[PDB]
Each structure stands twice: as C-alpha cells, then as structure tokens.
Amino acid sequence: CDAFVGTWKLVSSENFDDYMKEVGVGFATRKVAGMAKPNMIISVNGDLVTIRSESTFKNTEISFKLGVEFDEITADDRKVKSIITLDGGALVQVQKWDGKSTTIKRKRDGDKLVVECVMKGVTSTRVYERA
Amino acid sequence: CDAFVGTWKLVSSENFDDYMKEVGVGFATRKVAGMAKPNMIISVNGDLVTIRSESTFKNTEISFKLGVEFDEITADDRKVKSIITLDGGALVQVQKWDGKSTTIKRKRDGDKLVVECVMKGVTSTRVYERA
Known part of the structure; x- marks a missing residue:
C-alpha cells in the first residue's frame, strides 16, 4: 500500500450524484453529501490498513x-x-448489501490518486492530490 | 446499547495526563491530546456498534x-x-498490546456518561453530557 499512504485532498468529482442515486442515497442526503469535499487519509500499521475520510457530511474510517x-x-x-x-496495483474494494454490490477502485495515475466508484454501470470518478 | 446511543460532549476530565503517561504516550502527543475536547458519538446499526471520537487531536472510530x-x-x-x-449495564472495553492491558469503562450516571480508563491502577475519569 506504499503508493497509497498519505493525506489526499479532492481536486475533481464527476458523476457523483448519479452514482449516489444508483446506490439508493436519498434526494435530500445527496445534496448535503454532494457539497462535501472529503479528504482521504490512508495509513498502515502492521497488516492493518486504514482509510479515513473527513468532511462536512461525515467523518468515516475503515480499518481492514x-x-x-x-x-x-x-x-x-x-x-x-x-x-x-x-x-x-490498485486497491479494489467490493461492497455487498441486500443482494447488491458496488466496486470502489483506488489507483495511482501520475501524481494523483483516482477513485472510481461503480454501480450497475454508473461510475463516479474522484481525483485526489497529495495535501 | 440504547442508553449509550447519542452525541456526547466532554464536561470534565480528571487525571487524564497521568493515565496517558502510564500507557506510554509521548510528551508531545499528551499535550495535543490534553488540549482536545473530543465529542463521543455512539451509534448502532443491526449488531454493529460504532464509537466515534471527533476533536482537533484526532478523529477516530471503532465499529465492533x-x-x-x-x-x-x-x-x-x-x-x-x-x-x-x-x-x-456498562460497556467495558479491554485493550491488549505488547503484553500490556488497559480497561475502558463507559457507564451511565444520571444524565451523564462517565468514562473510566485504567492502566496499572492509574485511572483517568472523563464525563460527558448529551450535546
């Protein structure tokens, strides 16, 4: 995960709302979540990888x-x-719930970290650069 | 868990620095951690319990x-x-690492949530009220 470790700030977002629609996020909630500009903080401790996301919408963390x-x-x-x-060479995440699934791919592209979240052929692309 | 769900804000801290010393937290970290006034946000989703701490020091979360x-x-x-x-009726957490252990007890006392963290007979006590 060497390529991923660091603090990443959001530089561009494409098709986020439509991805959220596909996932089933409520209309009102999509508005608030769309306004957020989350950072992504990725770290490693032993065999545990942590992805933190910090924004006005929600602070989240997964450790895995x-x-x-x-x-x-x-x-x-x-x-x-x-x-x-x-x-x-990408970090690929599959999320499953209620017979549904979405794939979140995190991949390096030059000096950027590109995050592609896919559901039923709808793709949101978010581009991050190091803070 | 019903008595614990909510957003809790710190109202008192007793012996926190000495608890951190016992844990082996370094001076500079103890300073920044001592300066922070973290909220504690406890939620439940099916059988998953989540405890989130938000402050200037760190945003953390455990789901379990x-x-x-x-x-x-x-x-x-x-x-x-x-x-x-x-x-x-308390949430009792035991953390183990490197042959050491510390116990974190979260209990209700009237309209407050009392958090006691014990490491080798040094106890830090932090009390929270609903936000």
Whole structure:
C-alpha cells in the first residue's frame, strides 16, 4: 500500500450524484453529501490498513486487512460487507448489501490518486492530490 | 446499547495526563491530546456498534460487535486487540498490546456518561453530557 499512504485532498468529482442515486442515497442526503469535499487519509500499521475520510457530511474510517471480509457502515448508513484487495496495483474494494454490490477502485495515475466508484454501470470518478 | 446511543460532549476530565503517561504516550502527543475536547458519538446499526471520537487531536472510530475481539489502531497509534462487553449495564472495553492491558469503562450516571480508563491502577475519569 506504499503508493497509497498519505493525506489526499479532492481536486475533481464527476458523476457523483448519479452514482449516489444508483446506490439508493436519498434526494435530500445527496445534496448535503454532494457539497462535501472529503479528504482521504490512508495509513498502515502492521497488516492493518486504514482509510479515513473527513468532511462536512461525515467523518468515516475503515480499518481492514487485505483480502479479509469485514463489516462496514457506510457514510450513507448502509450496513455492508467489504473486501479489499491489491489487484493490478490498485486497491479494489467490493461492497455487498441486500443482494447488491458496488466496486470502489483506488489507483495511482501520475501524481494523483483516482477513485472510481461503480454501480450497475454508473461510475463516479474522484481525483485526489497529495495535501 | 440504547442508553449509550447519542452525541456526547466532554464536561470534565480528571487525571487524564497521568493515565496517558502510564500507557506510554509521548510528551508531545499528551499535550495535543490534553488540549482536545473530543465529542463521543455512539451509534448502532443491526449488531454493529460504532464509537466515534471527533476533536482537533484526532478523529477516530471503532465499529465492533459485542463480545468479539477486533483490531484497533488507537489515537496515540498503538496497534491493539480490543474486546467490548455489556457488563453490569456498562460497556467495558479491554485493550491488549505488547503484553500490556488497559480497561475502558463507559457507564451511565444520571444524565451523564462517565468514562473510566485504567492502566496499572492509574485511572483517568472523563464525563460527558448529551450535546
């Protein structure tokens, strides 16, 4: 996870609302969540990887081991099962709940960290740079 | 857990610095941690309990099931194993790392939430009220 460790600030967001719609986030909530500009703080301690997200909407944190399924309460209050892997040099997260699934891919592109969240063929792209 | 769900704000802190010393928290961290006045936000989603701490020092979160050991990275960056129980109507947390242990007790006392953290017979006491 060496390529991912650091504090990342949001530089661009594309198609976030439509992704949230696909996920089932409420109309009012999508407004508030759309206004947030979360940072992403990624760190490692031993075999535990932590991804923190800090914003006006919600402060979240997941702590996990690569390849080991874990319980997560999402920023929009879904209770999901997540599994995160190192796959083609990306961190790939699959979240499953209520027979549904979404894939969140975190990948380096030049000096940026690109986050692509996919649900039913709808993709939100968020671009981050080091703080 | 119903008696614990809510947003709690710090109202008193007693012996916090000495507790941190006993834990082995370094001077500079103890200073910044002592200056912070963290909220504590406790929520439940199915069988998952989440305890979030928000302050200038750190934003942290643990999500866990009662009676099931889990991995935790503490605010002072210790990698510990935690187990949390409902015991005499209190939430009792035991954190273990490097052959050491500390116990964190969260209990209701009237309209307050009293948090007692014990390390080798040094006790820090922090009291919170609903926000």
